[PDB]
# Entry
Amino acid sequence: NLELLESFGQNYPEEADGTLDCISMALTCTFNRWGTLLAVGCNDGRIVIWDFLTRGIAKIISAHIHPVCSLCWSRDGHKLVSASTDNIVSQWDVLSGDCDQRFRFPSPILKVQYHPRDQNKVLVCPMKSAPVMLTLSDSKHVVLPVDDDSDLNVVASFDRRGEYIYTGNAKGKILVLKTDSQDLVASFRVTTGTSNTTAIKSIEFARKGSCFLINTADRIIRVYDGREILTCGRDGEPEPMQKLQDLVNRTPWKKCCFSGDGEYIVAGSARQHALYIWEKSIGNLVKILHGTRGELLLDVAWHPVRPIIASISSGVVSIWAQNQVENWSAFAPDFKELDENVEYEERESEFDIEDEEDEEVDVTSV
Amino acid sequence: PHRYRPGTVALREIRRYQKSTELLIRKLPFQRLVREIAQDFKTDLRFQSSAVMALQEASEAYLVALFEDTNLCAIHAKRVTIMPKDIQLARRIRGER
# Structure
């Protein structure tokens, strides 16, 4: 989409680069599929959408009176789904902003998600009760059965392909269910610490493969591979690909997401407002970031095809990309700015030497 | 039509201010100064009052010592009027810069 001759040693974000000093009171953030837009919820129940290439504010849509605390994009990028303390199964359009669904169903919702291929299947995570999957036209709702019923705090999601439903209680027991027939094909209790269990805060997934993340509450982010769960099956005992923590400040986390290529992991503090970035493979911290030193972090995004990171603090959404360095030879490619004494003798065809197209390419193709 | 020879009011104010001890800078502008430059290190702090008084005492004593060493410099240069190259000389000699 962008320049292909641009890669003069591309980087991974370092700078502050300037923010959106336009509308405060942000609450959450998420990108579309390609990484071209960003929906942001207000405090009174509105939507802020910012376009990236023009760096322009795309659309402002006023949803309701309750604050918007959950958002997701469709696969085409045309159906926004959201839920709040308003208790309403909502569905919104991007050309018009229409109230297509309105079903005020109790125990207000903490997270929504589409099935990643069919936009008919949507995720509903209540205040207390077990998570619910719905349809669009009719009210066919599928509450997943939970053996515990004692936490009243169950997290569940769909993975990259939508093959299965990874579910998780607040006791740290996982119940893998098939995405349509609810086949309990795999189960594991998380091997927390020495013996004593922990809660589960959230679970997210990737864009390439089946590596994923577990966000517990003992300040330890765990990384598993979904094919290892598939290889285990029932009564699985997975031990993680890579464990993550920072014991210097003993910092419990608020939000995590992956890179675009599934190579890098960002995760944010709940205390210091300082972002960390890790390598998936070799397994160490690579860079600490900072910001306004005394603010409270809310939500962190990532841009898939290009190293851009969105933060949220005090209703301000930062954008961090390199403060990139421009130079000569784009104005004049025949001249290149050297530094020192460069010798030019390697070619031998000098000192007065004189020696002795057919591709038809379409112009309106894709 | 009665006015003093110039300098008399200066010397009597010198004795009048050395015969007393109090806070000398007005307190609320100094408190607003302290909060405004404390903004830059951690947002939305919460001071006490005795910490502000301690800062005012430390800054008052530092300025008084600086001006007396400045006045020694200006008398050494066979002058009376203090010019800011004296202050910059004093902070260059003392080792703070």
